[PDB]
Each structure stands twice: as structure tokens, then as C-alpha cells.
Amino acid sequence: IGIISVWYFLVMPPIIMNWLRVRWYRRKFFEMYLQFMFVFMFFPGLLLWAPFLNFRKFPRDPNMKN
Amino acid sequence: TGFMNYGQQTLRAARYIGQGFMITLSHTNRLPVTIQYPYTSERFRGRIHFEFDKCIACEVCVRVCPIDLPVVDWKLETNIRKKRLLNYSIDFGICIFCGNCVEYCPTNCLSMTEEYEFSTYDRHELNYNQIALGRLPMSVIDDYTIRTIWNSPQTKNGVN
Amino acid sequence: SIKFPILDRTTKNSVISTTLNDLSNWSRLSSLWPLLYGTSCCFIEFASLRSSPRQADLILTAGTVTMKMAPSLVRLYEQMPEPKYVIAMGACTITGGMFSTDSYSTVRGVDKLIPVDVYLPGCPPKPEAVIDAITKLRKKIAREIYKDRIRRCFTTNHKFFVVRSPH
Amino acid sequence: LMIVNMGPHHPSMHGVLRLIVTLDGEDVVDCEPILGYLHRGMEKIAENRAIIQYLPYVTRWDYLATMFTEAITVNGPEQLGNIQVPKRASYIRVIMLELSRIASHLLWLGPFMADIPFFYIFREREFVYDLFEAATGMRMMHNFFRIGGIAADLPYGWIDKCLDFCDYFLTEVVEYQKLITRNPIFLERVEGVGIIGGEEAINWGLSGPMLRASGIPWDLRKIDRYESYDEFEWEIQWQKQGDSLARYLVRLSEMTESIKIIQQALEGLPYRFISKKPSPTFELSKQELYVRVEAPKGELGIFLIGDQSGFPWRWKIRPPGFINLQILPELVKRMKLADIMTILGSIDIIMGEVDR
Amino acid sequence: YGLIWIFVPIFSLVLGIITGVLVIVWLEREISAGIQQPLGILQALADGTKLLFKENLRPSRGNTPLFSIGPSIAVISILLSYSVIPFSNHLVLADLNIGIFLWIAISSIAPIGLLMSGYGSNNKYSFLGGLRAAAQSISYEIPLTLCVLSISLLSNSLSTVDIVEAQSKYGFWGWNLWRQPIGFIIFLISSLAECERLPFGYQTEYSGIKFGLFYVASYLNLLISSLFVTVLYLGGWNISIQIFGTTIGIFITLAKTYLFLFVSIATRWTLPRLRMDQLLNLGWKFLLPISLGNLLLTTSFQLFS
Amino acid sequence: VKPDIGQWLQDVEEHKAIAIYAPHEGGYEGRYLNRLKMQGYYFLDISARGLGDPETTLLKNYPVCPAHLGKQPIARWYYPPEVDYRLAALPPSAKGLVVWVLEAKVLSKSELQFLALLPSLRPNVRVIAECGNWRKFVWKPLAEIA
Amino acid sequence: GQWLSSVTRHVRIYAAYIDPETCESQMDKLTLILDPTEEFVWDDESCNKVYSYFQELVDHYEGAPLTEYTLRLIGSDVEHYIRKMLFDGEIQYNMDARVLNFSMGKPRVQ
Ligand code: SF4
Ligand code: SF4
Ligand code: SF4
């Protein structure tokens, strides 16, 4: 069960959060309904992915002018 | 048959709850707009842009103001009609941005901008100078987190 | 002309204690949750952005405060006394607003009534101005390390009876 | 008889007010409305300020519809000096005043439906404030009323959005009309209150929705020939059901009547921005002039005794809703703590014009 | 070994219900961000630590033991009855011969915490609010335990794992949605209405950790009512129309409790307060007689079984 | 997030002029200010969104000019300076430096930011903690463009 | 109602049964709470001087009805006395609160 636990706690949560990102607007309320059910079922694996956020913000083709 | 009338009232109630549930389920489909943080036209009347050498005489900002807040000291220079203006002190805690002297200026060096991010940590910091009031705020197209704000259009559904 | 602090040392200088202080401060800077406090022209930002008057310590004063409003306001701050502060989100919570000269029944700012961290431009700005204000406040609380839990009560009182004349 | 405090932070959000009641049990029987909370002293400062300086001050009265306050306080000096407004700017003023009446009634029924949600009306309100931004530029803090009309001109996008507002707005209005016929909780939770009739609402002080709730076709701008009201389509609510749902049908019919007025005024276009502007500064005369306009709450009024100076010698305002607040001491006698929320909703009042 | 294997289902269950109340907080925030238009997942723990690290805020009233244990009993009255849920054919906390009956007792000791809250607060506001909250916890208990009784009468068992197995005989139609939809409506209105959620304070002196206790007690009340929606009407782990059966069954019952969370929060946002008179008109003159009515119906119907 | 390193403290004690490129994503900015405050220092605040002539405001006792509401006179008095009075606002001796926390990178003028960074080089106990125009991550670039 | 006070910064009337910091119920015992916000230094001898001055002011200014207007007058000239005491340097500031707004203006070089 430790193999299945690290599988469900490592492979699942970035794909789950990615499906939460890329399907935030492209959804029926049926689709938002099943996504809400999925994110309710799939909560405590998202603890190692909650503070880290890397591929999130570039809605252009900009340059790092900082 | 009073409990039958209670049942008929709840039948009409269940019909209304189902119809209003369809209405609210359709109301939950407001996906494209979603106003939030970024993470208007020229008459925003936000932060007031000021120019120092174009400000010359008539002191109309201290007169048409509803509270008379502007404090500008001036000493007349001889034979050249120069008032020697100094320290254009505007307190935005005193200021309402109600906009009288913005359009009532004879010089019209008072113009408005779109800046409103003046939430500060102290009240004595709000006493601004004439060089702080001459700063171009922001070109809001040129941010990596701000897209085009839906000014002319509405419900574009183009971000997705 | 100011006073002098103590400034002896920082006793909690382990990695675990400063880690817990940083995490508790950042989570304290994350969970604003205001009790709203509208009932004025700055209530209009609430629809774009509890009821127990001792719960929410991170309230911002988004309202036009008057002299008759002031006893209930200082009682409500007595109901939020120790942990957190208030944010002035109105020119009338700062300078008295547009009636700063001639208004008798309106206080010239709550800066003579309550400790205020952040002063706003005042009259209803855009709904992201309150977001920038609570972000600044989060940067302010992030500077705070909970003052190393350092405590003083004055307790000034006269037990002589006043020359009273009630109704 | 446990005394309710009725504190400053109400469980509802309709202003700050004081309604201490003895309430023997849950039946409220005696009302003592204490006011003075949102007070500014408009009269003495208005005596100490000019018209162009108390003209930014007319925003703190009925700020859910700010066109009415500045409209009546600019229509004061227009009829005082007998300066003619051209027909184009006056009709555009009629359009924006009826749009502000629309905004006042929808911003009433928003938090009223929230107490008894926000984005069910904000889908409309974002385009409504887009119309306010295309009309004057501000959200609700406009300063665009002159003696000759609007201070600026209408842009070429605002007339197109005004043409689009009718089939953007009336469809969701009539989708919101059928809810009270469908949903019986409005037929059982706000049904009943408002038991005053017409001969009594004329008797005390009432005007607006509380006077049109009894089936009286009352209108100032129909009796007084003002802004050519008999040209446009009118249907003043003669709904005689009395109660609070009668007031809701009154407000739906007033919004639909304003929709009909604006829809007939979409293609009217009978004429510049400001007529009679030689100089930036002027004065006022000394007459005995009380000017009034059809408020959304009923006969907003401006009393004026002149000084022939830069300052008015007397400036007293008769607000509609503050005279409409007098009837609750009589509409408190046989109701509940669960009823006073519906009462202070159906008064349709904010405390900006109350204390002032 | 003598206590580790016994403690770890309790520990895993406490961690599971903390994650579930995190789900309920951020899921009501997500439905409010859908109907009202990452960092947000940890914002709920930030809420919990904002409510945790605070001031005690004790006034001058001399009811300090009741002031301490008021919100504590309000938490216990939900937390003690999480030993009851058969998430699968295994991983239930106890065998629990009286399954739902202990839940009815622990949910019935909740007005004790409500009256202890109404007396721990030296305020007439929270006094009247504790009276109202205790009275609506009392008032909505009877059709609640009536439809509980009717489902346990269909199953002829009180133990929850037995009724969860018993729902899977006819198949998809064997669930109690198609056996008692009327009693399902009873359990819907009793689940939504009791927790001061579907109609509507009384925390005007409780602050700091006690306000957080009332917070977590209300949302765990929502959690346990939702998990009984799962294990009564929707099914525990059966989708008919080793180790992996437990792992798929916990996903099935969590999808069912997410379904009821979405239905409950949506019905909260689309219904207002019953204004406290139709509330009791419902729970006494309407809801209790029709709960007795479908009790008589299921009593007549179990003769042939 | 939360990369455990005090390299920003090394930058503020080495360069003492760093643009804090950090978003409006909550309070992820004051943690290094809290570590400077826990080191015995004292940190006060400023903002360049309405600060004009910054060297004439931090020194040279810029004027008070109280805003009369049409009732009082001009009363051209001289208020004490910003950072000179802040150096006068250190009553004990254990305070090693004074941190000037600036939180407005826009409306700043590149020339005047270099003038303010040179004013952080004027007093040895002055630390410049300016903003960095709100990048997505937390970047501590030094005053190179200014 | 029950609160009868004119409470500002550094001056709070609070005519209630307050011996210690626990509020109550209301009586003729005016409990002058000073400095709620930790704005100035407020040494104990100077606090005793200001409290004795306020006692002399409420002793010489009574005789009329002690309603709210006398409370406004006595808090107002008590704040004038605190301002003229801090301007002469008897009351320094604090710089230990999170604001330190310098509510009475910066002391000049005069
Ligand atoms: S800016 Fe306006 S008020 Fe100032 S001197 Fe010029 S004309 Fe006069
Ligand atoms: S911006 Fe507005 S308040 Fe300020 S001086 Fe100009 S007109 Fe007066
Ligand atoms: S400053 Fe003006 S808009 Fe803001 S709260 Fe006060 S009166 Fe209202």
C-alpha cells in the first residue's frame, strides 16, 4: 500500500492541478460539476503542490526585463 | 383536506424550486467575464497630473475647492509679474478627487490619470510635492499580468 | 523626540522557531477575512471583493466615521484589542474627507481615535485598490515577527468622587 | 419586553439606523427610530458654499441614483434664472435620469433579495456602469450637469450601447419577473406587510412606491408639465393590491415604464452641450422658489430663498425617503423581528438623504 | 505493537476529516467563486491559523469552566461520531453493532453544547441565539431520526456496514434513492436545515480558539451529514450498474459526498432564510407528520420481505 | 516558494540597494524585512508613488506646509527630515542600521532612483529596500538600471 | 443607552465600575484610560502629573450638570494640556508602535 500511496500522492496531484488550470473556463456546468467532485475526492495529495507554482503566468511572448 | 392543501402548496413550491434551480444553474454559466485582480476612458478622475512651470497665477485651485486644501506659498518678484511659486502641497487624505479645478483651470495644467494605487502606511506621507505630481503613472498595456481590459467590447470570451 | 525601546536580543533564534514564526506570519498575512464594516459609500466595494463583533481582528474601516459613531467604534476596537490593527479606507477616516473644515459632527480622521496602518486615497477607488491595500498590509505583517511576544498597563485612576449632577 | 439594541452593524446591509422596540415576545409593538448617524450638515455648509462648490456636494444623498440629486440642484438655477435648456440635452438628461431610476430600483432589489444574489444583478450592473462610464466617465460620482445641459457631449459608442441596452436588459428583467409568480417563498415571507391604503398614504406624508402601492396613478411630472412627459409612453402603476408584492409590481412597472421611455427616446433626437455660457462664473437671484422632481422614492424637493450673492441664503432639501420613513412607526404594530427586514427593505431607503 | 495498530486508524481518520473540512471550506469558496466569479488551497489553513493564533478574549463573567467546554462540547458532538462511516467493505473505525444510533445520540448532545454556548457568553445576543440554535437542533431531530429509522427498517439493521452492503442487492435500483426518495427528501431537508445553514451568529463573546472550534464544528457537522447521505441513500462502495476494492470504494464514497456538498452549497445559495416561523411550521406540522407517514408506508412495505 | 536562504540579507549588507521584484501575491516581501528586524535593526517605511525630490525630502528639513481648509494661514514651517530624524529615531545603541523600506517602483524616474541609492551610500546606516516592478517570482536584483 | 463617554486618543472618560482593566456596572467613577494605542512615552511621574491636572480641572470645572458637553470640554482641554506638555518635552514620543504617525507634528529646530 505504500507504493499505491506514493503513486496516488505523487503522480496524481500535478495532473489534477493541471486539469484544474487548463479547464478553468472550457467547461460545461456538468464538467465543472464533475471537476468539483474530482477535486473533492483528490484533496490531500495537493499538499506538496500547494506552495510551489512555476508554470503559471505568461499570457504574452514577453522577455524577463526585471 | 388541509394537509392535502399543504401538499399542493409544496407541489407548487417544488415546481418553483425546480424552475429557479434551472435559472440559477444557467446563472452559474457566467464564465467569460470573471472580473478579479490583475495579479476605462480618459475621464477616470483618479490621480491628478500636475505641471509646475505651466502653473503660473490666479490661484483657482485653492478657491473652487470644496475644502480649500491646496497650500502654495508665493512672493512677488518685481516688474516681471512672477509669483515665485513653491511647494505645491496636496494632501490626498484631504483631497476628494471630485474634480473642479481639473476642468476649471485657466492654465489647464491640471489633468487626470488612471492611477488609484495610493494606499499608503502613513498620513504624513500623503502630503505630496510638485515633482511627485508630475509622474506618468503606467502604460497598462505593457504588463505581463494585465491583458487588454474590455473597454469597448463586453463579454468577449477570448481568453479561455 | 521619541522614546527608547529595550532591544536586548532575540531569544527565539532557532531554525524551527523562526520557521514557525515566518509560516504563522505569512498565514496571518494570507487570511484577511474582514467583518466588512460597510454602511457607507465604501460598502460598494464589498460586492466586488462575520456578525460576531469580537471575531475578525483584521477589519478595515470602510465607512464615514462621525462623533456619534465614535463611542461604538472605540468599543468595537476594545472588542478587537490586542492582536491586529485597522486600515483607514476613507478620506474621513484620515482627514475628515471633503468636510475637513466646517463639519462639527464628523471626526477629522480616525487617526485621533484608533491605530491605523494604511491610509487610502479615500472616496471609492477601483476594486483592486483594496486588494493592493491588503497586499501592502500583508507585506507589513510579514515585516512583523510578532514582536517576540514582548508585553504594559498604565491604570491611571482617581478614587475621589466627582462633583456629579445627574438628571 | 426585552429591549433590542438594534446596533450599528445590522445583519442586513441597508445603512446604519436605530429601531429600539420593547417587543413583548416576538411581536414588535412600539417603534422609536433614532437617527443622526450618517450626518453631514448640508444646509449650513450649502449656505457657506456656492452653487459650483455645493455642486460637488450633491453625491451623498441618494448615491444609488446620483442623477436625481444633481439634476434637481441644477434644475433649481435653470428655472430660477429662466434660462432655456435646448431639447436635445434635456432629452438626454431624461434618458440618463430614467436610467438612474432603473439603477436605483435594481440596486434596491439586489440586497433586498440578498436579505430575504449579487452577480444575478451584477451581470447587468457591469454594463450599467459601462454606460455610466460612456455617459459621464465616473461610476456614480458624476459632475456633468450644467445650466445648458450636459457638461460634455455623448460619444459615438454610448449611443450604440444605449441601443443595445434594451435587448440586453429587458429580457433578463422579464426572466426576473416570473420568479415571484413561480417562487412561493416570496408569496409567504414578504406577502402581507404594507397594509396602508390610498386615503391614508395621502393623509400622512407618503409618496413614491408607498403611494402608488394603493392603485393611485400619482406622478409629479405628469401633473406638472415637465420635460414633455406626455409625448412619451407612460404607465404609472395603478396596482391596488396594497402589500409588499404590490410594491414589487410597482417597481417592476416603473422600471418597465422607464424602459419604454428610453426605448421611445432611442431614436428621438430632436441642441448643443451648454447653452448660455459667456462666462465661467455667475450668481443667483432672490425669489421664493421651491423646485421638485419625481424621485424614485417620491418628490425630492429643493427649497431656496435667495441672497442675490454668490451663496444661497437658504438651502433646505426635502428628501423623499425621509418623509417615507415616518410611516414605519405605524407599520410596526403587529409584525415580527423576521418582518422588520422586509419592512426596511420595502421602505427603499438609504441613510444618505436621511440625516444629511 | 499493543497500541500502534489500534491508534493509526484513529490518527488516519482524524487526518482524513481535517482534509475533508479543508475540502468543505475551499469547496464552498469554489462554488462562491463560480456563482460570485494553488495559494487558495492553503488559504483555508491560513484561515485556520488566523482563527488559531489569536487572543483568548474572556470577559468578566464567572462561568470559566462552561466558557472553556462550551465550544469543546460543540466540537465533541460531531467529532465523537466519526467512528461510524463504512467507506468501503473495510477501513471502518469500529464494528459498531449500533451504527447510526450512536450518531443520533452524539448529534442529540449538540444542543447541550448549544446551551453551554448560550450560557458561556455573557450577552443577550448569544443567549437568544443559543436558544434558537438549540431549539432548531431539537426541532429537526425527529424527522431526521424518523428517516434514519425508515432506512434502518428497510435494511432491518442498525449497523452501518450491514446497511451499506444491504443496498447492493437489486443493483443500481437497489439504492435507497429508488426505495425511499420521499425519505431522501426528508433526509435532505433535515441535513441542510439543522446546521444553521439552509435557514439562519451567537458567537458574540466566543473568539480566538473558541470561534475556530465553532467554525470546525459547523463544517464537520456538514461533513458527517454528507457522509450519512452517502452511507444511507447513495451507497457506500457499490457501482454494480483484495486491496484495490477499498481504494476504489473510498473514491466512490468521496465522489458521493462531493456530490452532496455541491448540492447542499448550491441549495444554500439558491434558498434564503425560512424566517424562523416557516422553519418550525415545516419541522413540526409538516415534516414530522410526513416522516411518520412514510414510516407507516415502509412499515407496511416490509411485510412481504 | 519559501527558499530558506539569507542571501537577501547578504545583499542588503553588501550592496544595500536591491530592487525587490515580487508580485502582489500576498505578503511574501516582509519576511526578509522581518529577518532584518530580528537582527536588531529598525525598519521604517516610505513610498515613491507620491515622493518628489527624494534627496530634498530625506534631508535638508523639507517644509511642513499645513493644509488649511480656507480658515488658517499658510504657516510655512520647516518639518524635520525623513531619514535624519529617523537616525535621530534610534534611542538605544544596539541598533546597527536603519532600513528604509520603499514600496513603489513605478512613477519613480530612473535618475531619482540612482539619486536615492547614492543617498543610501551617503549614510552608512541606511538600507535601501526598494521594489522591483512586481515580477512573478521573488527576485532581489541590485540597483544596476538605476 | 449605557455608554456615556467622549473617548478619543489618550483621553477616555469611561464612567463605569472599572477598578482593574475589566470593564463593567456604570457609575460616577470616571476611569480615565490614557494611551490605548502606545503612541508616546508616558513616564509614570508625568502620567501622575497629567492625572492630577485632570483632577484639578474636573474639580474646578464641575458645579454645572456633568452631561456630555462638559465631557467634550474637559477631554478637549486635557488634550490641549497634553499637547503643550509634549511640546515642552515633558512627553516624548514612543517609536514602539506599528504606526508612529507623529500626531502633534515634528519638533522643529527652533
Ligand atoms: S495651475 Fe491653475 S490655479 Fe494654479 S496658477 Fe495655474 S491657473 Fe492658477
Ligand atoms: S482634485 Fe478635486 S478636491 Fe482636489 S483641488 Fe481639484 S477639484 Fe478640489
Ligand atoms: S471619505 Fe467620502 S466616500 Fe469615503 S467613507 Fe468618507 S464620506 Fe464616504
Tab-separated table of N, CA, C and O in Angstrom, chain D residues 218-259:
chain	number	residue	atom	x	y	z
D	218	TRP	N	-50.157	58.306	-9.457
D	218	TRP	CA	-49.571	59.557	-8.998
D	218	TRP	C	-48.247	59.804	-9.707
D	218	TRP	O	-47.413	58.898	-9.809
D	219	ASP	N	-48.055	61.038	-10.172
D	219	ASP	CA	-46.818	61.439	-10.829
D	219	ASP	C	-46.733	62.957	-10.780
D	219	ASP	O	-47.696	63.643	-11.137
D	220	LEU	N	-45.587	63.473	-10.332
D	220	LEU	CA	-45.356	64.911	-10.390
D	220	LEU	C	-45.189	65.382	-11.825
D	220	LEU	O	-45.769	66.398	-12.226
D	221	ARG	N	-44.398	64.652	-12.615
D	221	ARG	CA	-44.062	65.075	-13.966
D	221	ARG	C	-45.187	64.824	-14.964
D	221	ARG	O	-45.058	65.216	-16.128
D	222	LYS	N	-46.277	64.183	-14.544
D	222	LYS	CA	-47.498	64.131	-15.338
D	222	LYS	C	-48.442	65.276	-14.989
D	222	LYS	O	-49.042	65.877	-15.885
D	223	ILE	N	-48.577	65.582	-13.696
D	223	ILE	CA	-49.381	66.725	-13.264
D	223	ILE	C	-48.707	68.028	-13.676
D	223	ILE	O	-49.309	68.881	-14.336
D	224	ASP	N	-47.446	68.199	-13.286
D	224	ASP	CA	-46.658	69.339	-13.735
D	224	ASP	C	-46.054	68.997	-15.092
D	224	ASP	O	-45.349	67.991	-15.225
D	225	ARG	N	-46.341	69.821	-16.097
D	225	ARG	CA	-45.871	69.583	-17.462
D	225	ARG	C	-44.369	69.824	-17.511
D	225	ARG	O	-43.908	70.966	-17.589
D	226	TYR	N	-43.595	68.740	-17.474
D	226	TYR	CA	-42.155	68.829	-17.282
D	226	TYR	C	-41.458	67.837	-18.204
D	226	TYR	O	-41.769	66.642	-18.183
D	227	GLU	N	-40.532	68.363	-19.019
D	227	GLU	CA	-39.671	67.595	-19.932
D	227	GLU	C	-40.456	66.791	-20.967
D	227	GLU	O	-39.978	65.750	-21.432
D	228	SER	N	-41.645	67.294	-21.339
D	228	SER	CA	-42.540	66.703	-22.348
D	228	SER	C	-42.877	65.246	-22.027
D	228	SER	O	-42.650	64.340	-22.828
D	229	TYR	N	-43.422	65.029	-20.827
D	229	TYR	CA	-43.703	63.670	-20.378
D	229	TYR	C	-44.909	63.078	-21.098
D	229	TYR	O	-45.024	61.853	-21.211
D	230	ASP	N	-45.803	63.927	-21.606
D	230	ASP	CA	-46.981	63.446	-22.315
D	230	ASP	C	-46.694	63.079	-23.769
D	230	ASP	O	-47.598	62.599	-24.461
D	231	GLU	N	-45.467	63.295	-24.249
D	231	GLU	CA	-45.089	62.776	-25.562
D	231	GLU	C	-44.737	61.296	-25.483
D	231	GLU	O	-45.099	60.515	-26.372
D	232	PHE	N	-44.033	60.895	-24.431
D	232	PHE	CA	-43.514	59.544	-24.300
D	232	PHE	C	-44.602	58.592	-23.818
D	232	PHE	O	-45.682	59.012	-23.396
D	233	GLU	N	-44.308	57.297	-23.903
D	233	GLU	CA	-45.197	56.290	-23.341
D	233	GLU	C	-45.121	56.314	-21.821
D	233	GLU	O	-44.035	56.288	-21.235
D	234	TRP	N	-46.283	56.363	-21.178
D	234	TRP	CA	-46.354	56.341	-19.728
D	234	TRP	C	-47.335	55.269	-19.289
D	234	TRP	O	-48.367	55.050	-19.928
D	235	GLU	N	-46.991	54.591	-18.199
D	235	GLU	CA	-47.951	53.740	-17.495
D	235	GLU	C	-47.562	53.773	-16.017
D	235	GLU	O	-46.769	52.951	-15.552
D	236	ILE	N	-48.144	54.723	-15.286
D	236	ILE	CA	-47.900	54.817	-13.854
D	236	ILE	C	-48.734	53.751	-13.155
D	236	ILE	O	-49.906	53.538	-13.497
D	237	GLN	N	-48.120	53.057	-12.197
D	237	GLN	CA	-48.649	51.836	-11.595
D	237	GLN	C	-49.916	52.130	-10.808
D	237	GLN	O	-49.869	52.673	-9.702
D	238	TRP	N	-51.076	51.706	-11.324
D	238	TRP	CA	-52.341	51.861	-10.546
D	238	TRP	C	-52.646	50.531	-9.849
D	238	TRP	O	-53.812	50.217	-9.665
D	239	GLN	N	-51.630	49.813	-9.392
D	239	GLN	CA	-51.747	48.491	-8.788
D	239	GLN	C	-52.267	48.660	-7.367
D	239	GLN	O	-51.616	49.299	-6.537
D	240	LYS	N	-53.437	48.089	-7.095
D	240	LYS	CA	-54.175	48.346	-5.864
D	240	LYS	C	-54.177	47.138	-4.931
D	240	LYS	O	-55.114	46.936	-4.154
D	241	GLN	N	-53.126	46.322	-4.989
D	241	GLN	CA	-53.035	45.179	-4.089
D	241	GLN	C	-52.424	45.543	-2.741
D	241	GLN	O	-52.415	44.704	-1.833
D	242	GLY	N	-51.908	46.756	-2.594
D	242	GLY	CA	-51.504	47.262	-1.280
D	242	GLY	C	-50.214	46.783	-0.658
D	242	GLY	O	-49.426	47.597	-0.170
D	243	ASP	N	-49.962	45.477	-0.688
D	243	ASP	CA	-48.919	44.859	0.121
D	243	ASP	C	-47.530	45.066	-0.493
D	243	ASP	O	-47.320	45.903	-1.375
D	244	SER	N	-46.548	44.310	0.006
D	244	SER	CA	-45.171	44.473	-0.447
D	244	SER	C	-44.957	43.915	-1.847
D	244	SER	O	-44.124	44.438	-2.598
D	245	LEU	N	-45.677	42.850	-2.216
D	245	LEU	CA	-45.600	42.366	-3.590
D	245	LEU	C	-46.293	43.316	-4.555
D	245	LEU	O	-45.921	43.381	-5.734
D	246	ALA	N	-47.288	44.069	-4.072
D	246	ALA	CA	-47.820	45.176	-4.857
D	246	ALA	C	-46.759	46.241	-5.085
D	246	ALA	O	-46.671	46.805	-6.176
D	247	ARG	N	-45.920	46.504	-4.076
D	247	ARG	CA	-44.805	47.429	-4.257
D	247	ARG	C	-43.755	46.865	-5.205
D	247	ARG	O	-43.105	47.620	-5.937
D	248	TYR	N	-43.588	45.541	-5.229
D	248	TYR	CA	-42.624	44.955	-6.154
D	248	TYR	C	-43.134	45.020	-7.590
D	248	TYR	O	-42.355	45.262	-8.519
D	249	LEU	N	-44.444	44.832	-7.787
D	249	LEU	CA	-45.036	45.055	-9.104
D	249	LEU	C	-45.009	46.528	-9.494
D	249	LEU	O	-44.858	46.843	-10.680
D	250	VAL	N	-45.152	47.428	-8.514
D	250	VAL	CA	-44.965	48.864	-8.732
D	250	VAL	C	-43.561	49.152	-9.251
D	250	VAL	O	-43.384	49.883	-10.231
D	251	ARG	N	-42.547	48.544	-8.636
D	251	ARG	CA	-41.179	48.839	-9.049
D	251	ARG	C	-40.821	48.173	-10.376
D	251	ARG	O	-40.085	48.765	-11.178
D	252	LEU	N	-41.358	46.975	-10.645
D	252	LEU	CA	-41.207	46.367	-11.970
D	252	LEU	C	-41.885	47.203	-13.050
D	252	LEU	O	-41.339	47.383	-14.144
D	253	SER	N	-43.071	47.737	-12.752
D	253	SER	CA	-43.771	48.565	-13.724
D	253	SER	C	-43.092	49.915	-13.916
D	253	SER	O	-43.119	50.456	-15.022
D	254	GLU	N	-42.465	50.463	-12.872
D	254	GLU	CA	-41.722	51.713	-13.024
D	254	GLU	C	-40.454	51.505	-13.842
D	254	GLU	O	-40.114	52.346	-14.687
D	255	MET	N	-39.756	50.386	-13.617
D	255	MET	CA	-38.599	50.063	-14.448
D	255	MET	C	-39.004	49.811	-15.894
D	255	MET	O	-38.327	50.272	-16.816
D	256	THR	N	-40.128	49.122	-16.116
D	256	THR	CA	-40.582	48.861	-17.480
D	256	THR	C	-41.091	50.130	-18.153
D	256	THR	O	-40.934	50.300	-19.366
D	257	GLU	N	-41.678	51.047	-17.377
D	257	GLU	CA	-42.121	52.328	-17.919
D	257	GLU	C	-40.933	53.192	-18.314
D	257	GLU	O	-40.959	53.853	-19.359
D	258	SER	N	-39.875	53.182	-17.499
D	258	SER	CA	-38.640	53.864	-17.867
D	258	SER	C	-37.967	53.215	-19.074
D	258	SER	O	-37.373	53.921	-19.896
D	259	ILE	N	-38.052	51.884	-19.191
D	259	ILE	CA	-37.566	51.188	-20.384
D	259	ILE	C	-38.339	51.632	-21.619
D	259	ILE	O	-37.749	51.870	-22.679
